[PDB]
């Protein structure tokens, strides 16, 4: 019974809408534009992870460092608790030493 008895409504995808059609444009902004701009400057997203990557602990540390003062109170409390938990887990748990 864990199965739907009707076909789901058809999902139509426009492969040639503007977003898909122009996807990838300016990814070579650096090597084709005399390196005035780095391609990572094209990234739109959270201010604390534009052109940067890390595990959950590093992401949380960076978020606290960069926008911690602007965070809501309980969100910041949750982030502090999460950093503490992730520190304990990554530095004290695991199969490997």
């Amino acid at each position: 019974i864990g199965i739907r008895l009707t076909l789901p409504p058809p999902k139509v995808v426009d492969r040639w809408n503007e977003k898909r059609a122009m996807f990838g444009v300016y990814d070579n902004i650096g090597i084709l534009g005399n390196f005035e701009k780095h391609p990572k400057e094209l990234i739109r997203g959270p201010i604390w992870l534009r052109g940067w990557k890390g595990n959950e602990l590093q992401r949380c540390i960076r978020k606290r460092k960069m926008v911690g003062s602007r965070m809501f109170a309980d969100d910041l409390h949750n982030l502090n608790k999460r950093i503490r938990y992730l520190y304990k887990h990554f530095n004290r748990h695991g199969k490997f030493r």
Binding site: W16, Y26, N28, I31, I43, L49
Partner: protein, 190 residues
């Protein structure tokens, strides 16, 4: 993937509302031992290993590798007869129907990527023709990329774009190891 930022996030058992008190004592009730009503085992509880916050997938291939990818894409289009060089993108009219019919007559693909040197000097006729088309996409030379070259069946380049691309991609060959970012002044680099 390098631009990707997934915004999926789940609440852990620490972040789900409530769930402080121990539901029932360890022994006596005949029920399983539990510490909170928000553990992952519970309905409405936390997620043990769900997605965590906005995660970035950012990484950079070496710029030599990226330039080589551009070169390989160009060679592939040329070898498979999908590359067409134009003297200019000037059109007799800005009518999209003319452009579509021209591609159909010349047996171009269902999708065409037209590349002009710079954004400003692109002819108004081709600008108007391509602004109304979905599979005919017009980009400046600085916007050329492997993903769009592969998405579009045919690649149309102007002669200035060809010269520009040759210069930029060949510069990656025979260039020194950088002393500092190339945005900074160099003796011979514009």
């Amino acid at each position: 993937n390098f631009k990707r930022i997934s915004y999926a996030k789940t609440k852990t058992r620490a972040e789900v509302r409530g769930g402080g008190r121990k539901p029932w004592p360890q022994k006596g009730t005949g029920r399983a031992r539990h510490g909170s009503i928000r553990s992952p085992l519970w309905r409405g509880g936390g997620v043990a290993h769900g997605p965590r916050g906005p995660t970035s997938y950012y990484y950079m291939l070496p710029m030599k590798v990226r330039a080589l990818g551009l070169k390989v894409a160009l060679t592939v289009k040329l070898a498979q007869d999908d590359l067409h060089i134009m003297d200019s993108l000037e059109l007799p009219t800005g009518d999209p129907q003319y452009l579509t019919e021209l591609a159909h007559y010349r047996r171009w693909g269902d999708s065409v990527l037209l590349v002009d040197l710079t954004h400003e000097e692109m002819p108004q006729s081709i600008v108007e023709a391509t602004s109304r088309l979905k599979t005919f996409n017009l980009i400046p030379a600085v916007g050329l990329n492997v993903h769009s070259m592969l998405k579009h069946q045919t690649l149309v380049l102007t002669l200035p774009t060809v010269a520009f691309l040759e210069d930029k991609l060949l510069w990656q060959d025979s260039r020194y190891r950088p002393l500092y970012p190339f945005s900074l002044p160099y003796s011979d680099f514009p």
